[PDB]
Design a protein around this ligand. Sequence first.
Ligand SMILES: [Ca+2]
Length: 196
Amino acid sequence: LKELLKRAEELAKSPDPEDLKEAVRLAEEVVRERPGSEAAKKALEIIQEAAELLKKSPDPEAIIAAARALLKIAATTGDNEAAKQAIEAASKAAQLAEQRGDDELVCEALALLIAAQVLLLKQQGTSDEEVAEHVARTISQLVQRLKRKGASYEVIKECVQRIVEEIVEALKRSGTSEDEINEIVRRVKSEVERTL
Ligand SMILES: [Ca+2]
């Protein structure tokens, strides 16, 4: 346990994305094994440290790993700054993926971006009706744009599935009850159906 924690702290000092991704995995393991311990709190500090270096990489896959880790911290702790950092990283990744016309990679980044947006909206007190409207408009606009662009059916389906999955996961990790999540998804589905 403490061994995993020490090695994660070491790997988090290396700007190499392979070392940083491993640092995140080791620390996230500590969190999963000792959820509310002091080692878990130490692990979250290491994850945030490693993620801030990963986000500075020029590689979209590395930046996405940073956004995913920052989003997990945000949901786990209710840290608004963590959520804003996840948005920053996901946005950077989305633009680099767009640059190379990789819609699949764009959607990976957007799913994390939208999930972080939902988290912040909830942390700031926005209503579930407004959250659902934000998500529905974003999905509807994205689906229509990818259709115009020529993205395949499976790419678009995966895009939407990933967005919804990341939102649900982030809301669950942040303590949102399953009753509230289901109601939010219901609203989103109703609006997307009308639009689409
Ligand atoms: Ca996840």
